[PDB]
């Protein structure tokens, strides 16, 4: 196409009006109707009550070289809206209809506003069971003074009742699983605002790829309908087994199963463990999102592990109860216990400060030591969630606050609080361009004048927190004391008395007592994603930052080493990542290059994991 000639205008130029056209090519002329609708709206949105199109022409050049398009427009004047007259079978709702109809006298007529008012009347009536209202509207034009009056013919019709709610997509899940999520009860009046709750509820569970709502009339009765939901189950969870047997490892194994839906019953499970010559690990986690019919949840986990030299082990239990307090907020609380023991520890400044605050007196530079405690704790938290998807959110925000407090009588005295937040904001009517913010904070400390135990310290960095850095790389590093090592014949020169002469810096992360991490991501569509991928893979661009610091660090005794009390040493990186919902789950592929780094930082520009978080 070479040129589109729009003629007959005086109020607007061609350059602006043509800017809303889809055409700007050969064999595409069939889309012209949409541009004409655009013109009708453009002028109708400005009060041109008499605007119309008298003719259009499309023609070929000689020898099919190009196309000319010409549109003949008759442009009228602007009309004012004097008021709105509403009459008919209002059925007692005239006050709300009038409130939805109020305008400022003298406002420019806008055809879209009229359509919106009609749609709002239908929406209002749907709330009270008027499933099929009959609403029509039309303008009255007085040309003597360019005045338009709006007339609306409203007939609410009949109330509808729901006779049965049927499902046709449950191949594995129990029927009860979906009925628990409906907020519309059978044998009661229909509410459009109540039925729509079901399509959100069935998405928040995260068990379905799609939820299709429907309303069908009963052929034998003018006032009853059936509601039918169609779902397609997403394969969820996996079972893994591996063999670690070898000539160096001996006989070893790894195995576990994790599902967010167990055999379709609604219970979540996780069973994991491994055994080899140097460490043992096992964990069992089971929880019931529905203990009672009203949504009270209950579950917990048991765990055990040990590591050989330093040498340590721990085990414990956590039982948590929780429940909703409104449609969107919920609370959790529970109790637990952990046993911990250490032996053959390398002398460290932070660890020894802890031990001295605890009343322990380890010998200087001597690995022949041990320590053990039994700690009983109280767990609690709070959540908020209005996201519209289980895996790839498009709107809403999520907040998850958690924490722990020790119980007097325990060996350790501490508290810990964390906060996990994320917000999705769309910038696209088709929800393809979205801005996602994510933040995390955490802080804790001791009570009674004692210190926080070092094994509960926070670490940051890794593909789950700050992309591009090695796991647990961000934060204060260990400083070792100079001397009872059994590795002296071969090894760390600072630990062995033969070479250990003074205090030394190191790259061994100890973690901190406070952290803050944040990032911003842009979620976008790409030209290389086909329908097979359009529904399963998300492509995004991102910028990450974060900082971890040591509360109660005392720099006054250490002048030749970095000061870890300064929280401002923020590490930052940026990059691009792809999140793919494969048959094995939401795998995450990412590459990033740190651009702001500090001494001691370890980089890992490319990371991959199996996702299933964030």
């Amino acid at each position: 196409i070479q040129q589109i000639n729009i003629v007959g205008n005086h109020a607007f130029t061609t350059d602006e009006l043509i800017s809303h056209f889809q055409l700007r090519r050969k064999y595409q002329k069939q889309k012209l109707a949409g541009d004409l609708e655009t013109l009708r709206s453009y002028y109708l949105d400005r009060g041109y009550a008499r605007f119309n199109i008298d003719s259009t022409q499309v023609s070929l050049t000689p020898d099919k070289k190009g196309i000319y398009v010409t549109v003949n427009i008759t442009e009228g004047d602007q009309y004012k809206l004097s008021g709105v007259e509403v009459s008919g079978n209002l059925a007692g709702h005239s006050a709300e209809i009038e409130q939805l109809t109020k305008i400022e006298p003298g406002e420019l007529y806008n055809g879209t506003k009229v359509t919106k008012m009609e749609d709002d009347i239908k929406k209002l009536l749907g709330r009270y069971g008027y499933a099929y209202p009959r609403v029509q509207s039309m303008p009255e034009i007085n040309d003597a003074d360019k005045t338009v009056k709006l007339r609306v013919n409203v007939d609410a019709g009949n109330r509808f009742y729901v006779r049965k709610i049927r499902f046709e997509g449950n191949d594995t899940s129990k029927d009860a699983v979906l009925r628990r999520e409906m907020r519309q009860m059978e044998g009661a009046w229909l509410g459009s605002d109540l039925v729509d709750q079901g399509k959100e509820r069935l998405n928040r569970l995260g068990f379905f790829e799609t939820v299709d709502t429907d309303t069908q009339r009963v052929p034998g009765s003018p006032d009853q309908v059936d509601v039918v939901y169609k779902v397609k189950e997403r394969n969820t969870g996996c079972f893994n087994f591996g063999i670690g047997y070898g000539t160096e490892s001996g006989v070893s194994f790894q195995a576990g199963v994790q599902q967010d839906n167990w055999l379709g019953t609604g219970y979540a499970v996780g069973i994991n463990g491994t055994k080899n010559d140097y460490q043992t690990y096992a964990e069992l986690s089971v929880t019931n999102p529905y203990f009672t019919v009203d949504g009270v949840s209950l579950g917990g986990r048991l765990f055990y592990n040990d590591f050989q030299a330093y040498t340590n082990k721990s085990y414990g239990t956590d039982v948590t109860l929780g429940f909703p307090i409104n449609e969107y907020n919920s609370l959790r609380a529970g109790l637990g216990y952990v046993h911990n023991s250490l032996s053959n520890m390398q002398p460290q400044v932070a660890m020894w400060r802890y031990l001295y605050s605890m009343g322990e007196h380890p010998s200087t530079s001597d690995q022949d030591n041990s320590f053990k405690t039994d700690d009983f704790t109280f767990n609690y938290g709070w959540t908020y969630n209005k996201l519209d998807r289980g895996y790839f959110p498009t709107d809403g925000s999520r907040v998850n606050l958690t924490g722990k407090v020790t119980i007097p009588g325990s060996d350790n005295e501490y508290y810990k609080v964390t906060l996990d937040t994320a917000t999705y904001v769309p910038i696209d009517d088709d929800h393809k361009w979205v801005v996602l913010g994510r933040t995390r904070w955490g802080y804790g400390d001791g009570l009674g004048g004692k210190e926080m135990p070092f094994y509960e310290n926070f670490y940051a960095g890794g593909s789950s927190t700050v992309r591009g850095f090695q796991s647990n790389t961000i934060g204060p590093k260990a400083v070792y004391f100079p001397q009872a090592s059994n590795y002296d014949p071969d090894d760390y020169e600072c630990a062995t008395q033969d070479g250990a002469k003074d205090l030394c810096k190191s790259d061994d992360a100890v973690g901190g007592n406070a952290m803050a991490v944040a990032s911003l991501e842009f979620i976008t569509p790409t030209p290389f994603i086909s329908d097979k991928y359009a529904n399963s893979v998300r492509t995004s661009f991102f910028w990450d930052m974060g900082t971890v610091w040591d509360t109660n660090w005392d720099s006054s005794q250490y002048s030749g080493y970095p000061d870890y009390s300064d929280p401002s040493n923020i590490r930052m990186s940026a990059g691009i990542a792809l999140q793919w919902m494969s048959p094995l789950g939401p795998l995450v592929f990412s590459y990033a290059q740190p651009f702001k780094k500090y001494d001691g930082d370890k980089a890992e520009q490319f990371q991959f994991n199996i996702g299933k978080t964030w």
Binding site: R163, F167, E168, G169, N170, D171, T172, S173, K174, D175, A176, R179, M185, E186, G187, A188, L263, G264, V293
Partner: protein, 213 residues
Amino acid sequence: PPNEIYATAQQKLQDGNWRQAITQLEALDNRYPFGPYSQQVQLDLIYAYYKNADLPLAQAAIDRFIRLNPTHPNIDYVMYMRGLTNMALDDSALQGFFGVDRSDRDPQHARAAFSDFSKLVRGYPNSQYTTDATKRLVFLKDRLAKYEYSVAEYYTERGAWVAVVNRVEGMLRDYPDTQATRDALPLMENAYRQMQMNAQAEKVAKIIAANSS
């Protein structure tokens, strides 16, 4: 040539891999689509799809066979196989192994199967497959009644007393001779008892007592 493909398929069907028989049958239909062997080959493929659990293909093959054979000396065999095909879509190995009660899954396929077996029994009352068809009809009838029962229990727990009464009446009209109805009746009585409808509760109590055993 169709004689060697046929002989190979027959040898594999008598004693052999189901996939090999399918491969030979497909080659025969692909190369000689209008020969006389199609009167057996198409059926062998549907049968083979059943044996290999290629259920969407068994259904497509059955629909094409029927469209091309408005009438046939063995059309009731094909209908019977369709009914078996639909029953094959209700279960799964995982539900069976752990002893899971499957009545709570959507019985879309159970109803389709019921319809096919009903048509088979009514259209061909002298069919050689009648006994098996009536055993399956009894099984499926209970398969459906359990679904209605489970939903009624859910609503009794939630408190939707009207939904409970209407669902149990539906059960009385559609499955008046099964176990699920005798078990459901106490739910009708309790739902009436949560509302001031004692006169109706008397009727429920009398029905339960008359058929008590």
